[PDB]
């Protein structure tokens, strides 16, 4: 509540300094969104599953909002790969490789344990969140918490990094890890067992126009 003000600008500094996206394009740290985006205000932990006690007020906000809007897929390769295609000018490459790959596999194992343990998480949230949409809230919050800790990580690593030329040594295991994520979603049966009809049922397809 005392020192964010600098980073508020920092997240936008280099992006406003540059105008040169020519194929690959970023939402500028996505840095413009409603109170939900403004709520991510703490050094949460990426290492572990969320500290459910932290988020009760967030859940009570979410109760004002609908949640049948959420894709299951992480879009791991899709979103992350474009925002990594950049390097130093031929220096500290060891460093860059190390933090990049380590963060990569950290997110990998993070999602792997999320999928392996989603039941315990959603139930431990529901224990005090008896809300009818609590499962969608849990899924959303999982995504959003990951995204926010990622935004903080990005904010922190924000550096010159002008260089841009693919390293296929980096991009090789790209496919292996991303396809393991999608295989995790395949391993998610998504459990059609007589509960999702309580949803808006894909908004009845909105007159087949959405």
């Amino acid at each position: 509540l005392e020192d964010e003000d600098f980073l508020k600008l920092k997240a936008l500094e280099f992006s406003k300094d540059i105008v040169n996206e020519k194929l690959q394009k970023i939402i500028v740290v996505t840095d413009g969104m409603k109170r939900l985006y403004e709520y991510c205000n703490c050094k949460n932990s990426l290492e572990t599953l969320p500290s459910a006690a932290n988020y009760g007020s967030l859940l009570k906000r979410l109760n004002l909002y609908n949640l049948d809007h959420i894709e299951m897929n992480v879009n791991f390769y899709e979103l992350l790969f474009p925002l990594t295609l950049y390097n130093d000018n031929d220096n500290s490459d060891k460093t860059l490789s190390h933090q990049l790959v380590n963060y990569i596999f950290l997110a990998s194992n993070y999602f792997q344990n999320c999928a392996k343990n989603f039941n315990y998480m959603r139930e431990t949230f529901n224990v005090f969140g008896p809300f009818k949409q609590i499962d969608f809230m849990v899924m959303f919050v999982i995504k959003f918490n990951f995204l926010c800790d990622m935004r903080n990580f990005a904010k922190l690593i924000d550096e010159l990094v002008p260089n841009k030329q693919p390293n296929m040594r980096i991009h090789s295991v790209l496919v292996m890890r991303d396809k393991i994520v999608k295989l995790a979603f395949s391993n998610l049966q998504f459990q059609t067992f007589s509960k999702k009809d309580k949803s808006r049922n894909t908004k009845h397809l909105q007159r087949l126009i959405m």
Partner: protein
């Protein structure tokens, strides 16, 4: 002398004779009263020992087991022990023979099932032979063990002479905690069984703490013991013993002489020992 409860199996009727008897270990004395045969047959573990120096050729040697479950099985397939809540559906006791069923009802204190069983026996030729007194002698054995266990053991160590925490050492392991207390719910017989099946992660002796593994292999469960990692993907189990897939992407290498060359070097066994809990011993 014979001690395996399953070696105590008998038939009330003339047809079946259970002619797959207990392993020799039934005659041995670990205080487990379980043939390793049956251990496999119903639980999928193999018993083992770790010798530990008493800083000397004097030793404390702790019995443990290894789970035999593969990487593919999940949920009920991975359950090793049930709750009394769910032993029935876990096992399909009806497929098991009536002596097995009644013995499990003894384990779970299901007096209602015991009563229904006696009420069915009232007219049976096993009741004409009063062979139910076989069950009552099993009860005598049990009650002796139980007066040696439930009053004793953990309760005795409420004297503080000893304590084991089954709680996960890592506070981050949010799935831990309350199960260590739920431990209290089970029959002390079972509690003894599990606690002597499972190695602690640490031993306190006031000389020094000892740490036996980096990270706990096992986890407490919501109904009964399950073969599961605390977190992450399951570690591989080389269990080593229909048109299905058999694919295994072997490395190409054809060399074999290397193996004969390397027989001189530690052929590291890959079993899954059970590490869980915090152990405390006085002195």
């Amino acid at each position: 002398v014979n001690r395996c409860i399953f070696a105590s199996i008998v038939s009330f009727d003339a047809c079946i004779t259970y002619k797959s008897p207990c392993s020799p270990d039934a005659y041995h004395d670990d205080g487990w009263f379980i043939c390793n045969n049956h251990l496999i047959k119903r639980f999928k573990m193999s018993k083992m020992v770790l010798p530990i120096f008493d800083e000397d050729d004097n030793q404390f040697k702790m019995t443990i087991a290894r789970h035999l479950v593969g990487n593919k099985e999940r949920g009920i397939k991975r359950i090793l022990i049930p709750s009394a809540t769910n032993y029935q559906d876990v096992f399909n006791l009806n497929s098991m023979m009536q002596a097995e069923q009644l013995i499990f009802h003894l384990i779970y204190n299901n007096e209602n099932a015991v009563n229904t069983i006696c009420d069915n026996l009232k007219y049976t030729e096993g009741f004409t032979s009063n062979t139910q007194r076989v069950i009552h002698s099993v009860y005598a054995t049990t009650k002796s063990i139980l007066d040696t266990t439930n009053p004793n053991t953990f309760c005795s160590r409420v004297s503080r002479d000893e304590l084991r925490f089954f709680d996960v050492t890592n506070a981050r392991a949010l799935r831990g905690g309350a199960g260590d207390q739920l431990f209290n719910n089970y029959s002390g017989f079972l509690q003894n069984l599990i606690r002597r099946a499972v190695a602690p992660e640490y031993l306190q002796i006031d000389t020094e703490e000892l740490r036996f593994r980096n990270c706990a292999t096992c986890i407490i469960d919501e109904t009964g013991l399950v073969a599961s990692v605390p977190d992450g993907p399951e570690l591989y189990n080389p269990i080593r013993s229909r048109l299905q897939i058999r694919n295994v992407l072997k490395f190409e290498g054809d060399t074999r002489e290397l193996d004969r060359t390397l027989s001189g070097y530690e052929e590291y066994p890959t079993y899954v020992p059970l590490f869980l809990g915090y152990q405390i011993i006085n002195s």
